Structure 1
Amino acid sequence: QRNTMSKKELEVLSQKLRALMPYADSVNITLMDDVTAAGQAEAGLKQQALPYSRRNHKGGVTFVIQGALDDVEILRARQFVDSYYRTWGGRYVQFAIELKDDWLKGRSFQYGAEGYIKMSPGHWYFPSPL
């Protein structure tokens, strides 16, 4: 989808790659599907049962994995991502992994569009919509 070239241009590209690689006899160019790539990524995360969020951009997909993961989860995730990267590389799909503590450190809060954080009984923060 994201490349627009003629057959002649592709051949020229092939020949220039062949000039960069003096040990190769020819370079075969194959067209792959972005939807396939993204789908195999999401299928792998479901198969590993990891919690995640997905974000789409004009030229990429980002999977955000964040929170208090357990050591089994961290092991599985590291193995899966390491396998995927070796197949598809890192240009199109990115995996963001973030260990972090529970949100707002165990204060209580009102999470509507008019939310606020209790600092302590008798003390309101009103920092941002939550």
Structure 2
Amino acid sequence: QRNTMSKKELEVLSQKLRALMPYADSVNITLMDDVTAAGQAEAGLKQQALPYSRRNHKGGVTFVIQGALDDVEILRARQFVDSYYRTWGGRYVQFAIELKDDWLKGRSFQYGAEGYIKMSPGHWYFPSPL
């Protein structure tokens, strides 16, 4: 999708790569589908039962895996990620893995459009829409 090149241009590109790699006899250019890439990523996370969120941009997809994770989850995650990366590279899909504690450190709050935090009984904080 993202490349609009003519066959002649592709041939020229091929020849220049061949000039950069003096040990290679020829370079074969193959066109792949982005939807396929993104799909295999998301299906792999579901196949591993990991919790995640997905975000889409003009030119990339970010899967954010964050929170309190078990040792088993961390192991499975790092194994899968290392496998996928070796196949597609880090140029289109990114994985962000972050350990988080409790979101608000264990204190009561209202999460509406007018949410707020109870610092202590008798103490309101109103920092931001939660």
TM-score bracket relative to the smaller structure = over 0.9
After TM superposition, where is structure 1 displaced by more than 4 Å over at least 4 residues in a row?
none
Aligned length: 130
Q: CA deviation at 1:121?
A: 0.0
Superimposed CA distance per residue, residues 16-74 of structure 1 (whole angstroms, 9 cap, x where no aligned partner): 00000000000000000000000000000000000000000000000000000000000
Gaps of 5+ in 1: none
Superimposed CA distance per residue, residues 61-110 of structure 1 (whole angstroms, 9 cap, x where no aligned partner): 00000000000000000000000000000000000000010110001000
Name the SS of the counterpart of 2:55 in structure 1: strand
- Distance in 2 between the 1:110 and 1:43 partners? 34
Q: CA deviation at 1:122?
A: 0.2
- Distance in 2 between the 1:27 and 1:13 partners? 9
Gaps of 5+ in 2: none
Name the SS of the counterpart of 2:104 in structure 1: helix
- Distance in 2 between the 1:33 and 1:102 partners? 39
Normalising to structure 2: TM-score of the pair? 1.00
- Distance in 1 between the 2:24 and 2:37 partners? 27
- Distance in 1 between the 2:102 and 2:86 partners? 33
Identity %: 100
Normalising to structure 1: TM-score of the pair? 1.00
- Distance in 2 between the 1:70 and 1:117 partners? 28
Q: CA deviation at 1:124?
A: 0.1
